[PDB]
Amino acid sequence: QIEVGPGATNATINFEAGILECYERFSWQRALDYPGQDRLHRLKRKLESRIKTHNKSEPENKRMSLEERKAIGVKMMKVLLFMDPSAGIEGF
């Protein structure tokens, strides 16, 4: 659905990268239940394979590890949640 173009795959990699960082932080509060903890780890592994297949078909100058993809993920999450583009790294 919608009108999604190319490069939505890259932005979904990144978006989910931040979803995972969110589950991680959540779990630190001993608040992620057991099925959800396995949901977290399944997310991590299938994300890492999506990232290596993706990075290979991209410029090495734009080839990013999971851990840098998760910084972009948190940034687009903070802009969605505060519906401010001014929250990417300027809104607090």
């Binding site: 939505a8 932005a11 519906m83 001014s86 990417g88």
Partner: protein, 147 residues
């Protein structure tokens, strides 16, 4: 010149705008290009992350040939709320924005604190924690300031 509006999914929308057009004209432009109404659009600089000022031409806000603008779409709406003196005032809000921030919004918008008044829709008092979809607001409708 040529300005690129980039959206979260990688789309870029190259508004050729030299001019001295305001941001209403920019939101209008892009709104024609991707079928999203001006009111559903928040905008900011790509690196300056500051949300653009309306009254000012974009040439003043240091936008130049090849600048970059971030576009976020928020399925929200426009409404009026009118005060004790009877004058209406427009407000765009998020359906999931809760009446609490709409209150605090008309606070400095008008010039009062938040701790005094009800706020009502269709003679229905609105409850501070509850969001606005609760109270079935549509395009352009009207909310009441209850002293």
């Amino acid at each position: 010149g040529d300005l690129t509006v980039k959206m979260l999914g990688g789309q870029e929308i190259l508004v050729p705008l030299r001019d001295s057009m305001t941001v209403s004209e920019l939101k209008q432009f892009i709104a024609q290009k991707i079928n999203v109404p001006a009111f559903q659009q928040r905008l900011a600089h790509l690196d300056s992350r500051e949300v653009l000022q309306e009254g000012v031409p974009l040439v003043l806000q240091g936008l130049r040939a090849g600048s970059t603008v971030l576009l976020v779409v928020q399925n929200s709406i426009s409404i009026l709320v009118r005060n004790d003196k009877g004058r209406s005032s427009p407000y765009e809000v998020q359906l999931k924005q809760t009446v609490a921030e709409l209150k605090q919004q008309v606070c400095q918008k008008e010039r009062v604190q938040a701790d005094q008044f009800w706020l009502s829709f269709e003679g229905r008092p609105m409850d501070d924690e509850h969001p606005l979809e609760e109270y079935g607001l549509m395009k352009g409708c009207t909310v009441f300031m209850n002293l």
